[PDB]
Symmetry: D2
Subunit: 343 residues, 4 copies
Amino acid sequence: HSHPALTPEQKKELSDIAHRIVAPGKGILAADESTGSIAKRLQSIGTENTEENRRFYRQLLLTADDRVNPCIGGVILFHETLYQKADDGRPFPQVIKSKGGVVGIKVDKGVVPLAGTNGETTTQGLDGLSERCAQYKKDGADFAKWRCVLKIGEHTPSALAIMENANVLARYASICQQNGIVPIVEPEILPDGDHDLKRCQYVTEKVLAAVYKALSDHHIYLEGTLLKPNMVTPGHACTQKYSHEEIAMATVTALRRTVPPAVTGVTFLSGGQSEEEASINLNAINKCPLLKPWALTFSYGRALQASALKAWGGKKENLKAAQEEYVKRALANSLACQGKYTP
Amino acid sequence: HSHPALTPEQKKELSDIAHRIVAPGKGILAADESTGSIAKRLQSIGTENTEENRRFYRQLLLTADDRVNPCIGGVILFHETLYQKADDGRPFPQVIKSKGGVVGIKVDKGVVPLAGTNGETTTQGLDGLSERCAQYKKDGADFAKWRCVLKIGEHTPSALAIMENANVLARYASICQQNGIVPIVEPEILPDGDHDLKRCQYVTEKVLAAVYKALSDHHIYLEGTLLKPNMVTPGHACTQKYSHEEIAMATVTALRRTVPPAVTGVTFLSGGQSEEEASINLNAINKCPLLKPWALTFSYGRALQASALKAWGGKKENLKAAQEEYVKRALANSLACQGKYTP
Amino acid sequence: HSHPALTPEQKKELSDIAHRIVAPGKGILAADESTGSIAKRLQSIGTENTEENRRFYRQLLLTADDRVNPCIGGVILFHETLYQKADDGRPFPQVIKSKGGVVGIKVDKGVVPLAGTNGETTTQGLDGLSERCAQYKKDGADFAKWRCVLKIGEHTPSALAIMENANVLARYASICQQNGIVPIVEPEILPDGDHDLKRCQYVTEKVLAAVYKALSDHHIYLEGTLLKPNMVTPGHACTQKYSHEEIAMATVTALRRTVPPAVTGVTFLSGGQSEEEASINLNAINKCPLLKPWALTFSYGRALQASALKAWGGKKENLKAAQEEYVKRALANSLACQGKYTP
Amino acid sequence: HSHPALTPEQKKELSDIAHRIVAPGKGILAADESTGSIAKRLQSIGTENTEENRRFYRQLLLTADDRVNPCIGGVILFHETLYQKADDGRPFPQVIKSKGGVVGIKVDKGVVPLAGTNGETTTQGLDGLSERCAQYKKDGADFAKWRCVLKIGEHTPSALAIMENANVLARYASICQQNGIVPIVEPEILPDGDHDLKRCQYVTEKVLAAVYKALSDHHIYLEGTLLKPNMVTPGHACTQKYSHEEIAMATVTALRRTVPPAVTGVTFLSGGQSEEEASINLNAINKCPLLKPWALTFSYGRALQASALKAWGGKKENLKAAQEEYVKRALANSLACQGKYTP
């Protein structure tokens, strides 16, 4: 029959955390880059990838001035970032909490190939995820991140890949909720290929419907979850041009057709678009005339950090400049989340 | 890839019809009853079941005065009711349109047993449903009704029954949308047994999630659809008492966890509760503090007609009295749909 | 829990009927053709489509001499053929029984389009199928036929089409078994397009796996069922040539990977191949070195009747010639079923 | 379309390994027990759990004399057992190969609870399973074992648990096949509770159908796989007694209804029955009159080692006695697999 996966106290805690993450005007700073993932970004400058360099970069992202507090409602950290400290000795999770943000952790262990599929992948990281999530909860992490990677090809995504990603996302959500951690479901669809806006919307609707069916099957408390979907955008190789209003219409339409309103908020990911373009698209999404029952916030990795990294240059002299650039971009993204971003 | 089941013109027509059906202050009069279904209702009086008696009863329901016009946005008719005329020779669909309502038709052909299940049933009526729906469209019917029956038992509803009902509802929706008719999805859950409010909510969430996954799988345009679910209520044999606020909270929570906001409106069914109780529960649902992205209207079969039938008594002398009783119940249910019903 | 869809007596009756249909050396004469389906076949000669002409053609198919008795274990009839009589007044089902065959009936009501799919169709005929199957059982029909049509395209068959066809086949099987009629599951895959043998085998495996999963979900007694799949063959537009041994290997491999051994027998359909080619492919399938736990018989519509129709010519003078031609083809197909067809 | 998960060479290698494991007269010695799993077994004697004690026990199991060679076709080892050596310095995998057996490894990382289920669990171990399987392949392990635990309760197994276990087993099979390792699928159903033989058969059929549907969905090469299902037996608390013939008939019927013949062999697990009872049930299964297209061998953990452990007593003096007892039990189980075990 009905066996409660979560007690009312657990549901209340998850709902409170989720609402804190996507409170109005607040979004998510995705600093969840591995040693090899941030290695490419640090190589764009020429600065070597070291523990100290990573620590100082994440301190720069997290120790920004006070005006970034009401704009960032959550920060996703890597495993090593959760255990680093700022210059004054304050741990990074404590730095995030002191600014009013919610500490997040990337719990997925990367994508692995799916046999019999056209390059499709599924995400691993479910081994010992209960103990890992409990430890993260004791270490200050109140929500988790799980990136399930999907792409659009001539025969992709297949039924197997969509069902696999939905199932793994549902299992990760179940484990995180059992451990008191709000799961952020990311059924990311890669904007690779020449697919247009209509096909991206169709694939996003199919993927989100399967994801939420899997969440229902796994008894996931949707009020204690957040969604991190790709913005419904044309492929990078698509020649046809779409305005920001069309992209916003397609994204909001795809969300309204599949995402139940119980989801606390939808935190969009950049997905390879420029900082200004991502902010403008988020603003258009929040300005869409369609009724939006969820908090349409931002969970941006590159759209919040690209110009901050460029300004920093790997040297301590541009610390303040990179702080200022990240702060201004976070303010822009918060305005987009509130729907009044006017560049 | 993405093959459009409906052209943008078809989608616009379906959305317009659906929004007309569940426009604010407007609900659905479920006047659909088979010859044997209305036979029991007319036997509660002692009046024989004839074609003329059925015609006069449906004329009494459909020829109400001007105060019903802003309260009834749709009328579900039986097959024979769609082809009857009023006293002045006006066809019943034309009578409905002249009052600003939307003509509906019951297209399902009843429930049939599912083998290997504990008395569970699936609904038939998909044979030639395209031709039937096209004929109904030419005959004035703009939306269709499909009652899928589910119950709650010690091992019921099973996976087979839920999946079957969701699949048949999705096929019905696909056919109706292809024929220009708005499909009203009714995954009705019988309030039979001693199950409590929590189990009813759990079963409703499972059923609605499966139903909407099936709708997504069948490429159903959810903006051109309406939902007719059971109110989340305790079983008739349940000893524990729940207030109207608790029932409303459970129903709205079950809807928000499964139903996507793209659905134009949720038109509740009476499901064996009294007229006053159904109106009060609808008012409480529309007064629920949770955000409700859909038009929570009424699609009541007996909750709009029980007192009208009792007042009519099968004789022409109480025509005005029964019409007035039905009108007052329609006004009460419209007030509940707008959330300001104060008995 | 476990609710028995069929009592042990019902299971025994279904198993007995199924084993009688696919007894060693015996196959199925698929004489089922609608008024318009056989109209094209009779137009290939120049003979008008009338009730008497159809009756005489089916009498010619059914009243063949004695040596066709151990070669035909079942005859699939149309609805009107089940109620016609031979020249001596014996009903066609009684003529079939007197020859040791098992009377079959086509219960599906044709295919209907699936919206949102690339020309994919699903089969209807579930409305009142219980009453129809019971009436067929009282009229002598011991098994039923249900043709679910699938094709192979660049994006076809889709998940929706495969799941729909499997679900409808499972429902038809459940109804037939409840009515004491052995259901012949036909998830036919059209040999249309340029797809090769490998892709046909892959699609056949996917379709059969989904079909048998649906049968399990619907509690279908597989011992009381027969399978009527397409021979795994390259598309008609495929330029690459495959030998009969390769086709047989692919077909047997596809059957062994998806069909459970509980299925009484696999009765192949012609699927648009010539009479001699169909017989040779069946012989190669039965000569495949792989272990085959089922009775690999034939259920041939045109592969048993093409030469009989050509010899008949629509005139009564070639009655004996068409009898002899159909008999020789049935003997060849029985030898192929036994694995000793040597042209 | 059809993307080959395995090349023909990979398929041939997997088929060869699987056929070697379940060659006629050969079964599987399930010697894989964790440090805590074998701790309980060694505590039944009174011998402390140490690395040396575990090594000597597994050497006693693996260094049996020549009469075990034609009876044991595979040995499943724990992670630490794969890297231990015999007294003469020969590694345990090399000892197994020198006896003609096939080296196996337990790759699952135990079961974890499923939220919202009545104590149901799913199995973990998919993290880095590709690298682990590749390393095992280089270390001599040619097949892998994955124990998915299911139980029978008043509402158990649920749809979520069955689907989860089938999905995880399919992913494990995909990874193992991609790494050249034959996956042994074990959807074990616990014989706990008062459920009878009929309900165990029903649950086994449902579980196996879902498992093989998941295997088809994950493009699993079934010829390169083996099945390790529970014997269909009444629950340990079941008061009704069933003969060995009834248990064998139920098990073979459940296998024939779900398992496709492409599976190389079905290697039964003891599942808490005594050594003699397990051997007799295996013999009855192989003597079942129903046609069995697979090699019905044994994969017994306790049914091959209980008396060996009892005779060993933890001291080196009874090395020969315990070896002889294990050898005689292996001969008995091989005779049962061949169908001529006569106690």
